[PDB]
Symmetry: C2
Subunit: 258 residues, 2 copies
Amino acid sequence: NSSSMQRRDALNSLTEYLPKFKWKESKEKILDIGCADGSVTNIISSCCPTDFELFEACDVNVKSVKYATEHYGTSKMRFRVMDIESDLPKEMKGKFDHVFSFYTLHWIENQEKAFQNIYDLTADDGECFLTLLAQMPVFNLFDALKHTEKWRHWLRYIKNFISPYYETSDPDVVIELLLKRVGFRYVDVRCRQKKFEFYDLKSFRNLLEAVSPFKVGQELQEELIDDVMEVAKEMRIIDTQNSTAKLIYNLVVIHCRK
Amino acid sequence: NSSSMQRRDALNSLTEYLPKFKWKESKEKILDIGCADGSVTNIISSCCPTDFELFEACDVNVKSVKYATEHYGTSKMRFRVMDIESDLPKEMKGKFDHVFSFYTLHWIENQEKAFQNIYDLTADDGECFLTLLAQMPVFNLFDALKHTEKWRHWLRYIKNFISPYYETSDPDVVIELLLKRVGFRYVDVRCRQKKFEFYDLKSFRNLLEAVSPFKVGQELQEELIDDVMEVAKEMRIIDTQNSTAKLIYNLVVIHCRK
């Protein structure tokens, strides 16, 4: 049960960039896109040196984890279920002075919609701090499995989708070009190479079981992840001699203002 | 219910210094002095890029909060009740490759004992990352109340104690001199000026109620903290016109090796 790399990365990126944004607000309404567990939300709020006396809003699509935090993240700092790929509830358009979107580790289908939503959810002279993934071997892992002669036929009807910036050259400029066109006045995108090591394959298997894009039966789910773990060895994502797994991935840190 | 300044400070100091220490260990046993809520312990573990497959040990003196986290911080990463001012359980002498001690906000009676314990709890070529408080108006606040003609007589038998480094000039050199004498081969002590603002007096009162060094009856505890809040206005720790409270305090960041 480790979501640690998301938590570690959310943390290091937040701390590194805290000094770079200006709050200069008497009241303040802050939104956190892809909250999941409130572990990050709870440290964000404490690390934010501003008033935000109420309406620290946060959303996720998985509604079990959201409610699980509604019980734990506590009151007088709102929780919600929401998708940023869905059409915007106009009620909260331009409601938030600060938006946080740390990477989800679920493949996103439509980016510019999500970016346009981040643009529409932000008030004026309001800041956005987003991180997302340019290269992530976990995505490459499942994609390969989707293309094994065993599974290729049965997962054909599942949509791979496309990121206009994922595993492209200079994803930082691509995303900068996109965000300006969406209307963002200030933007500052940087690539950060990250490494996360799993010291037992059981920990690695639990991530893949959490992240699997595939809806196999309780019957098959074992067999599926067994074959992903095998593909992971072929890919050298797993060290077969150490029984370790190292993820080398590229993080895109977006700091922008409207 | 905000322990945020301890959490915010633990965080910023940890992240800033993560790149500066070398793990270079195959196994690893890590101890966290003054754990309280496992909020910091849970982010430390995720931010530590090392094996520590088991024996991530942690202690506090208040046994309700410890058990409260034993239920929440989960298994295969040990919890314990312990005081670092008490005589060392030899069982864990030189057991830990990394020791963390983020400041407690309770006045410590004996430092060199605690420092000597930090020295005895650490294995060889093992790192210590400690933060503690050089100047903190909260301590000055209660001290003044201890010396009001109303309370002076009734709190006379309570011990004020002394820090050889607290509200001294160059506390950084004093603590460096002490830690070397304890035996530490590498030491690197720095002063960090910190500011934390409370935007309502109710939040401030809840801290003081949590931190109060004084054992007044449920009957009197209200009257006591009412008088601390009044002393806080006299001290200009509380802005009477904004109904805010700003804490300007000095943090001592210790990075050392045996």
